[PDB]
Amino acid sequence: SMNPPPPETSNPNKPKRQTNQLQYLLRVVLKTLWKHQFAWPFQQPVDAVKLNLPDYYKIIKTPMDMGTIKKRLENNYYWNAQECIQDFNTMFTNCYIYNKPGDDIVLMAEALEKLFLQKINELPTEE
Numbered sequence: 001s002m003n004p005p006p007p008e009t010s011n012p013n014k015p016k017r018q019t020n021q022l023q024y025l026l027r028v029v030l031k032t033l034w035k036h037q038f039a040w041p042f043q044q045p046v047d048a049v050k051l052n053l054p055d056y057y058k059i060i061k062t063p064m065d066m067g068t069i070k071k072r073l074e075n076n077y078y079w080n081a082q083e084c085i086q087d088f089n090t091m092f093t094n095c096y097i098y099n100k101p102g103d104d105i106v107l108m109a110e111a112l113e114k115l116f117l118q119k120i121n122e123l124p125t126e127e
């Protein structure tokens, strides 16, 4: 069985910024979801070998996880908040696409997404 390489977390030629909105996405949004009791399945790329999901990367073509998002925020990979918000939404959408309604992993994603939406609602205005 085979995993793909992880999503990109380093690209020197990609333009980057350090902004109050991206600081908020690390200090509030990522840290709030990361410490949650249901974070663990989302803290690293899906290991389709370990988890015996041989069709995962046949169905999910834009994989994303909070481990990757944490690295992107900590290594100042993003230009804007919308890029980072898209990564979170990709992660949740992948979970709902691959899994069945009422699956434990879907209930876990839904709990994290509720907190995500609460925090994004209070995204501060750009300085």
Ligand SMILES: CC(=O)Nc1ccc(C(=O)NCCc2c[nH]cn2)cc1OCc1ccccc1
Pocket (backbone or CB within 6 Å): 041, 042, 046, 051, 052, 053, 094, 095, 098, 099, 104, 105
């Ligand atoms: C991020 C994500 O979607 N992860 C997972 C997806 C599918 C399964 C999984 O095992 N699904 C059941 C087997 C299945 C269904 N369709 C194909 N294989 C387990 C997963 O993460 C580990 C886990 C296991 C149990 C509770 C919480 C997290």
